[PDB]
Amino acid sequence: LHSEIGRLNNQSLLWGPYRPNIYFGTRPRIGKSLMTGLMWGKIESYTDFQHTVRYTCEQNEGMKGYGWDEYDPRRGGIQSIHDIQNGLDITTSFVKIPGGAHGGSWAARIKGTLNDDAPKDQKTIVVFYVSQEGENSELEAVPSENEFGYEGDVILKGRSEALGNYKLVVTKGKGVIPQSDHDLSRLRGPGQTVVQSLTYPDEVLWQAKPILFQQLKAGIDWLVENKYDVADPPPPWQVYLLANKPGSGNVHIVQKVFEGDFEFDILFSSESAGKEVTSKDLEREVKQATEVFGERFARVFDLKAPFQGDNYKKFGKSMFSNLIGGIGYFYGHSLVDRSYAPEYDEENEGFWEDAAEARARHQEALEGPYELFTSIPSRPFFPRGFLWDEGFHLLPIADWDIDLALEIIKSWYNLMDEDGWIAREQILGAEARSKVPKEFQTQYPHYANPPTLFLVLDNFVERLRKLDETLSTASVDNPEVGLEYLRRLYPLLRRQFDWFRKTQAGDIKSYDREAYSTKEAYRWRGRTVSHCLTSGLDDYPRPQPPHPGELHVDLMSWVGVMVKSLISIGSLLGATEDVEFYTKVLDAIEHNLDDLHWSEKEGCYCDATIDEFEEHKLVCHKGYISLFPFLTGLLKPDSPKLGKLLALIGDESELWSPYGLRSLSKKDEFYGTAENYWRSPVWININYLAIVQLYNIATQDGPYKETARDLYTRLRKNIVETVYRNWEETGFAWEQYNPETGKGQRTQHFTGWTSLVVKIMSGHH
Ligand SMILES: O=[N+]([O-])c1cc(-c2ncccn2)ccc1NCCCCCCN1C[C@H](O)[C@@H](O)[C@H](O)[C@H]1CO
């Protein structure tokens, strides 16, 4: 029956606009198949379109905002794009229509509206781009009655083993299409819809902008050869109208030119389903999709006070729709250094100079292809899977659709190599690689990243203990199905757990170090003089210099998190032998945290090194790191050290700001130095952990219950209001928030773990 549930889920999630790297596009969860893309641009001159055309996501003075107003990957949603440069407001309404054997049909409306600044008579070029990969696939534009192009709809008929038979339709549209008086119209027509059907090698079909421009440039080359000059030139909009040449090929370019406002429709009809999809079906399904989204939002995200307001509800829907709407399907090769050079063992003083020289050997090579279905941090600046980010992204997604979060987890853990490594940053295919300098594409099998996905699994295990609607919860409703899901994954978690202990181990036995266990102590590989990228916390200050004696308290605590999950899932599958080993190991870590990482002098957990004179030294930099055993739920609620931590958390002169908890204390010598990435700013992901843990303490008989209840109440309020104010003010979620001004700084459109904010508002953790 787990198979039957599994089969239905594949067929439900197959189609989406899973191309979050572009403003709007579709692809299914198949690596070589059919993809679509939207391009638009105002045309006012003979050179301007190349600077105005839109395709891949950006954020500059020219673009006010864009994002999803409503989205569910099972049903679809609506996207708004506010384009200053092109003087346009754009709506992309996408909806999925179940039926047949090939993962349903779908449709999309594209509404353009001129804004008040735009000339009322602006010429807007719009393109719909369509490509197919496969050796056994075919696709063909049915030609037009009329001479020079289309007065009606454009029909593409295609076939593939993957999708069966299909018609994909680009309707005529509402909108004035401009007419050219020029002589060129005797030969090109006065202005109409046109199609070019081309063929290119399968590996370059993604490069839609250059493919388009080569055709534009060829049209222009043809004007010059045929004596159309500056003596009496045709209008710019007719110069950039392609010559109609429909047929068969693996690329199809559909081009329209509109004067003023416009809309038009894309109807994809699975032959294997009922009768074809109509524009009437698109309207109906859109209305139906809003009503489901509305009803679910209120059920799953019941905003508790003081955020019960409709302003806070519209803010909640925007943060959530953009988190889940940024889900992508990725396919291609990855750049990995598989040398396993001995220098990457970092067993030497000055280990960073050695590993630099091994990277300079450039042994890395493409490997795969790999496939990933993930939510992303940033549509415009880094639209790709980041390992520990996803553990934060899936916390709210898992509320909305626990079956969907488990499909993403499975997607991530199917990347694991024989050793138990998952690369922390997934750059799949050339489309991905085009948005990344060569130097930063290469992944390293000794670089780790916080095991945040265990948290999402912890939430699953609680629920399991205690048709779109039916499927969304099928893994908790059908307990047989849940345990079977775990039975298969569990091995992989256990491998990853063992990987951490082999590769990220620190040294006890070779130094003057007493402690309860000689086994347990951990050190992040990959750290440079001023960084530790693998920890998640780029420039949080660490012992100087970096050293092979180093122990990192935040890593040990992440191991804490896994053992507790393995203890938990292990218990459920009755792996008696296994749970007993973890039970030993959890006891050990608890003692060793204190024995190696606790400071009575500073009153908090610290990182460690060894001295100039070969003694163990604690190095204390009050901030996120200092709290880590608290943030990970490892301390007993009656603990005196926890009490000491609640004091530092509350303390205005250190971490506590009006806008949330500072990453680093105002008292620390590195407060607000260098790039200041994790050296003062407030990060929603770490705050979310502190909030969820305070709340646990505050809802339990015990010594700090009341102190907890107070800090939870204010922290919740400060974080939600700081995100909400900046959303009202700017329309954006920000990477981080400034602890002095409360302004969002660094990257816009971070949805992104800043969207955890909706789970904070719904409470009842
Ligand atoms: O290159 N480009 O595209 C860019 C552009 C930019 C601009 N531009 C313009 C205007 C503004 N800004 C930025 C920037 C960038 N990049 C860069 C990459 C990398 C990123 C990462 C993040 N993070 C971090 C943290 O720590 C961690 O934790 C996590 O994990 C991650 C994930 O989320």
CA distance readout (Å), 702 to 639, 687, 697, 699: 10, 23, 8, 9
Residue nearest ligand 1's atom 6 by CA: 381
Q: Which distant-in-sequence residues (6+ apart) come within 8 Å of 471 by Cβ?
A: 5, 8, 9, 12, 74, 403
**Nearest residue to 723 via CA among 744, 704, 692, 709:** 744
Which residue ranges make up each domain of the chain?
2-204+235-275
Q: 764 in the Ramachandran plot: left (φ > 0), alpha (ψ -120 to 50) or beta?
A: left
Say whether 342 sits in a helix, a strand or coil: helix
Closest C-alpha to 745, from 764, 728, 722, 714: 722
Rounded to whole angstroms, the Cα distance separating 443 from 424 reads 8
Q: At what angle do helices 402-413 and 479-503 cross, to 10 degrees?
A: 40
Helix axis angle for 479-503 and 553-573, nearest 10°, is 140
Amino acid (one-letter) located at 306: P
Best CA proximity match to 112, nearest among 28, 24, 210:
24
Q: Structure tokens of 736?
A: 């981080």
Tell me the CA distances in angstroms from 266 to 130, 153, 170, 281, 409, one per residue in order. 11, 10, 5, 12, 32
Tracing tokens 């996501």 back to the chain, one arrives at 57
Kindly list the distances between the CA atom of residue 752 and the CA atoms of 192, 375, 735, in Å, as whole numbers in the listed order.
42, 8, 8
- Whose alpha carbon is nearest atom 18 of ligand 1? 382
273 in Cβ contact with 104 (< 8 Å): yes
Cα–Cα distance for residue pair 612/622, rounded to 1 Å: 23
Mutate to test the pocket of ligand 1, among 382, 452, 453, 753 (most ligand atoms within 8 A of CB): 382
Q: Hey, which of 438, 747, 755 would you mutate to test ligand 1's pocket, going by the most ligand atoms within 8 Å of its Cβ?
A: 747
Residues 77, 379: Cα–Cα separation, whole Å? 17
Nearest ligand 1 atom to the CA of 436 is 1
- Report the b/e string of 573-584 with b at 16+ CB within 10 A: eebeebbeebee
CA atoms within 13 A on the CB side of 533: 13
- Positions of E strands within 5-137: 15-16, 25-28, 34-42, 63-72, 76-83, 88-97, 105-114, 123-132
Instruction: Determine which residue's CA is closest to atom 12 belonging to ligand 1.
Output: 747
Through-space distance between the first and last CA atoms of the chain, rounded to whole angstroms: 31
- Neighbouring CB atoms inside 10 A of 370's CB total 18
Whether 596 and 521 have beta carbons less than 8 Å apart is answered as yes
| CATH 3.90.1150.10, applies to 2-204+235-275 | no
Task: Give the residue from 570, 580, 448 showing the smallest Cα distance to 504.
Answer: 448
d(CA 706, ligand 1 centre) in Å: 39
Written as one letter, the residue type at 234 is P
Given the residues 259, 261, 554, 735, select the one marked as catalytic: 735
- Write down the experimental method used for this entry: X-ray
Of the candidates 324, 302, 294, which has an alpha carbon nearest to the alpha carbon of residue 751? 324
Cβ count within 10 A of residue 350: 12
DSSP per-residue letters across 299-319: HH--PPTT--SHHHHHHHHHH
- Helix (H) or strand (E) run with residue 586 in it: helix 576-592
Q: Could you give the CA distance from residue 625 to residue 123 in angstroms, rounded to a whole number?
A: 55
Q: Is 261 a catalytic residue?
A: no
Q: What span, in angstroms and rounded, lies between the C-alpha atoms of 732 and 748?
A: 6
Torsion of CA 663, 668, 671, 674, to 10 degrees: -110
Distance CA 370, CA 380 (A): 23
**487-490, long-range: CB < 8 A, 24+ apart:** 487/573, 489/409, 489/410, 489/413, 490/569, 490/570, 490/573, 490/575
Q: How far is the CA of 558 from the centre of ligand 1 (A)?
A: 24
Q: How far apart are the CA of 530 and the centre of ligand 1, in A? A: 18
Ligand 1 atom with least separation from CA of 435: 3
Q: Tell me which residue has tokens 């490594």.
A: 421
CB atoms within 10 A of CB 309: 11
* C-alpha span between 696 and 692 (Å, rounded): 6
Distance CA(551)–CA(513), nearest Å, equals 12
Q: What is the 3-state secondary structure (H, E, C) of 226-276?
A: CCCCCCCCCCHHHHCCCCCECCECCEEEEEEEEEEEEEEEEEEEECCCCCC
Catalytic option among 283, 419, 468, 538? 538
Instruction: Look up tokens 């301390």; give the residue.
Output: 635
* Cα gap 380→645, rounded to integer Å: 38
Q: Are strands 154-160 and 164-170 parallel, antiparallel or unpaired?
A: antiparallel
- What's the rounded Cα separation, in Å, for the pair 188 and 179? 11
Q: At 609, phi and psi to the nearest 5?
A: -140, -160
User: Rounded to whole angstroms, how far apart are CA atoms 427 and 386?
Assistant: 10
Q: Which residues surround ligand 1 with Cβ inside 6 Å?
A: 377, 381-382, 386, 388-389, 536, 538, 747
Query: Which phi and psi angles does 434 have, rounded to 5°?
Result: -65, -25
Resolution, rounded to a tenth of an Å?
2.7
Distance 624 CA to ligand 1 centre (A): 20
Based on the residue annotation, tell me whether 276 is a catalytic residue of this protein: no
Run of H or E including 365? strand 365-374
CA distances from 366 to 441, 442, 502 (A): 10, 9, 26
Q: What spacing in Å lies between the alpha carbon of 432 and ligand 1's midpoint?
A: 15
DSSP 420: S
Q: At CA 426, angle to CA 424 and CA 430, rounded to 5?
A: 155
Residue minimizing CA distance to atom 4 of ligand 1: 381
Q: Whose CA is nearest to atom 2 of ligand 1?
A: 381
Alpha carbon of 54 to ligand 1 centroid (Å): 21
**What is the 382 CA–ligand 1 centroid distance (Å)?**
6
Residue in 63, 386, 730 to alter for ligand 1 test, most ligand atoms within 8 A of Cβ: 386
Nearest-atom index, ligand 1, CA of 377: 33
Atom number of ligand 1 nearest to Cα 381: 3
Atom of ligand 1 lying closest to residue 437 CA: 1
Give distance in angstroms: CA of 349 to centre of ligand 1. 30
Cis (ω within 30 of 0) for the bond into 98? no
Residue with tokens 């105005």: 52
CA distance 398 to 461: 12
Question: DSSP alpha helices (H): ranges in 166-207?
Answer: 185-188
Which H/E stretch holds residue 698?
Answer: helix 684-698
Closest ligand 1 atom to the C-alpha of 378? 33
Q: Is the distance from CB of 399 to CB of 415 less than 8 angstroms?
A: no
Query: Among the atoms of ligand 1, which is closest to the Cα of residue 537?
Result: 26
Task: Quote the ligand 1 centre to 433 CA distance (angstroms).
Answer: 15
Q: Using CA atoms, how far apart are residues 446 and 525, in angstroms rounded to an integer? A: 7
Give the SS3 label for residue 591.
helix
Nearest CA to ligand 1 atom 16: 381
* 416: Cβ contacts below 8 Å, ≥ 6 apart: 422, 492, 495, 496
Q: Are 162 and 103 in contact (CB under 8 A)?
A: no
Nearest CA-CA partner of 267 in 154, 163, 161: 154
Question: Can you give 367-418 as a three-state secondary structure string?
Answer: EEEEEEEECCCECCCECCEEHHHHHHHHHHHHHHCHHHHHHHHHHHHCCCCC
